Amino acid sequence: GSSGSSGTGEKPYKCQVCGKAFRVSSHLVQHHSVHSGERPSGPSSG
Numbered sequence: 001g002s003s004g005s006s007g008t009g010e011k012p013y014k015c016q017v018c019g020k021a022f023r024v025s026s027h028l029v030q031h032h033s034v035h036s037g038e039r040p041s042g043p044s045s046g
């Protein structure tokens, strides 16, 4: 997850929950299902 520095060309599509970006719509979609499956990460204990 990086924006601003990576890729001088801002994509037309960008997530809202994480703020991701995908020059294409197809990819962005497949990513819209990555959050649903809460993964063990972050400040969570573990």
Ligand SMILES: [Zn+2]
Pocket: 015, 016, 017, 018, 019, 020, 031, 032, 035
């Ligand atoms: Zn996202």
